Write a protein that binds this ligand. Structure first.
Ligand SMILES: N=C(N)N/N=C1\N=C(N)c2ccccc21
Ligand SMILES: N=C(N)N/N=C1\N=C(N)c2ccccc21
Length: 330
């Protein structure tokens, strides 16, 4: 089997992407944030505290003839950004882009934190990291990909995120028309449960490439590119007036600037992030200071190749016996 679904930015800045997912019988379609940095499929639901729902579409398990309570199971997750959610668990039929998994754990939120409530466009998350990070207790549950894997034509999924435009998540096949050149594959460590890999270095704009190992994770659920402070300083030093602002919480730059590109290494290959991809717009409406798309990972404890980086590439999440990541230009 295979599946193919379009993913759409939630706003004009690509702050996140939503992908429609069919849950239950008859289908209830919710728009979920596909997150290769976490491993829970959770949804706003008929059980979510009413004051914490503001425009989201909810899953109602009582209206699904295939829903079954996973008796005794609960979940609770805290994300690196400080947001959180928790609740109980059903199993149900879940389809993405024509690919169907029966018996998928669907984690129904009883509580969500304020940032989830405030995002009326995101009805929940679909985790695509390794199932060892799944939070369901006392019986940990498998991700949608983990459950689908054996049925797929090939044990892979791909992320092809757009810049200020829709893109595609495919399951079970590589669309060789969606990229240029060849795919460079690189080793993955699953020891922390992430798609963790080592970039071979970077360049700023037209500058020379610096060969240096940068361990980090491929995370579709993180908006920005978080890298070591040395790398980030070298980038922003090429932008007149750019500075790290403690009040804003990161690097900002004049909205009048044209940003340089940023290149990262994948083995001997190179992925070029155009400068415009690094512009996240005014820090507050109408401000002449703009928010940078490359930020320091200092304090987070891991480097994160989030959407800013991934959207510059066609990215293969290879879930074969030995998992690997692939990157191609596009
Ligand atoms: N990851 C999410 N589930 N939602 N992320 C966001 N939601 C926003 N409104 C926003 C603005 C700037 C950066 C990220 C986000
Ligand atoms: N803290 C602030 N006053 N503004 N923070 C932002 N402003 C943006 N444009 C943006 C995009 C992505 C992530 C954060 C921000």
């Amino acid at each position: 089997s295979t599946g193919s679904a379009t993913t759409t930015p939630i706003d004009s800045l690509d702050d996140a992407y939503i992908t429609p997912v069919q849950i239950g019988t008859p289908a209830q379609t919710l728009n979920l944030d596909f997150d290769t940095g976490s491993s829970d499929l959770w949804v706003f639901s008929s059980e979510t505290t009413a004051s914490e729902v503001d425009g989201q579409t909810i899953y109602t398990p009582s209206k699904s003839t295939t829903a079954k309570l996973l008796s005794g199971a609960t979940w609770s997750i805290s994300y690196g950004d400080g947001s959180s959610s928790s609740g109980d668990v059903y199993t149900d039929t879940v389809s993405v882009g024509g690919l169907t998994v029966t018996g998928q754990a669907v984690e129904s939120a009883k509580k969500v934190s304020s940032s989830f409530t405030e995002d009326s466009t995101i009805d929940g998350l679909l985790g695509l990291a390794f199932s060892t990070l799944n939070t369901v207790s006392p019986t940990q549950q498998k991700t949608f990909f983990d459950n689908a894997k054996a049925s797929l034509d090939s044990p892979v999924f791909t992320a092809d995120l757009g810049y200020h435009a829709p893109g595609t998540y495919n399951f079970g096949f590589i669309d060789t028309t969606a990229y240029t050149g060849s795919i460079t594959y690189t080793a993955v460590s699953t020891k922390q449960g992430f798609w963790e890999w080592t970039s071979t270095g970077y360049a700023v704009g037209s500058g020379t490439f610096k060969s240096t190992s940068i361990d980090g994770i491929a995370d579709t659920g993180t908006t920005l590119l978080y890298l070591p402070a040395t790398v980030v300083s070298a980038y922003w030093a090429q932008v007149s007036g750019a500075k790290s602002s403690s009040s804003v919480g990161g690097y900002v730059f004049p909205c009048s600037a044209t940003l340089p590109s940023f290149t990262f290494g994948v083995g001997s290959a190179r992925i070029v992030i155009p400068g415009d991809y690094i512009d996240f717009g005014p820090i507050s409406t109408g401000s002449s200071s703009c928010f940078g798309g490359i930020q320091s990972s200092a304090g987070i404890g891991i480097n994160i190749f989030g959407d800013v980086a991934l959207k510059a590439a066609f990215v293969v999440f290879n879930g074969a016996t030995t998992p690997t990541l692939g990157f191609a230009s596009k």
